[PDB]
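Hi W., the 6-ethoxy-1,3-benzothiazole-2-sulfonamide complex you wanted:
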Amino acid sequence: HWGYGKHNGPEHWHKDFPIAKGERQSPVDIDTHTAKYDPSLKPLSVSYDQATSLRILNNGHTFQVEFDDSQDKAVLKGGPLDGTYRLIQFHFHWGSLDGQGSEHTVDKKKYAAELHLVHWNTKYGDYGKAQQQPDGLAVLGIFLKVGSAKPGLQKVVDVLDSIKTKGKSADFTNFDPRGLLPESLDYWTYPGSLTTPPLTECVTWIVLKEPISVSSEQVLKFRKLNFNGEGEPEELMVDNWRPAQPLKNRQIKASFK
Ligand SMILES: CCOc1ccc2nc(S(N)(=O)=O)sc2c1
Ligand SMILES: [Zn+2]
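Structure:
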């Protein structure tokens, strides 16, 4: 059904998913000159020491690395959040060229890609129930710019040939998502939505100010993935990002400046 092409891309999603035209859609442009420093926001607590990665999956829209979320292992807390949010997966959005690919923008700047670490609020007991609640999910967004390689990303890049096409998975154990973080945990935060269907308004977004650097070779390997399944016409998995949506009444808060 939905995807990222001319015929099924972001401009069409509202017909199956009317909340696409809602009041709290994501991503947004982060206007750094209107974001409000909030001295009461806490440092983020990213606690990934016990993370247990299990698998990597090409889901036809992105690839995702999934974790064991059946115990409090890898959790996000603090910052703007009230409870504890458990990591379930991360995935990326990227472009066909280094000058596009991120979902969020910063003063209209697009990055080459964006990493989303998806966490669910443990007060809701499971990820699927959390997806139905206004404060169900917290997604940590990290921009990727092209420059030096990110060594912590290479284990991911090297397995992508084994999941070229939609529906392929591979075991992916012992991956440490701490290797994908920038030095600083300074962030912006605002209330929003999933950026892909069903576009539910269930996300507290936490977008880090500092991008990570990845090499041109690393991002090129993302662009060799396919949206299609095996045996179908080849369609390169590129430009799997939703453009910025109207901010509406919302305020973006900053943890710094
Ligand atoms: C069953 C889980 O379903 C979904 C659907 C859409 C979706 N979008 C995001 S994002 N790009 O991080 O805002 S995470 C997510 C999970
Ligand atoms: Zn995403």
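Residues 116, 118, 131, 139, 194-196, 203 surround 6-ethoxy-1,3-benzothiazole-2-sulfonamide (ligand 1) (CB under 6 Å).

W.
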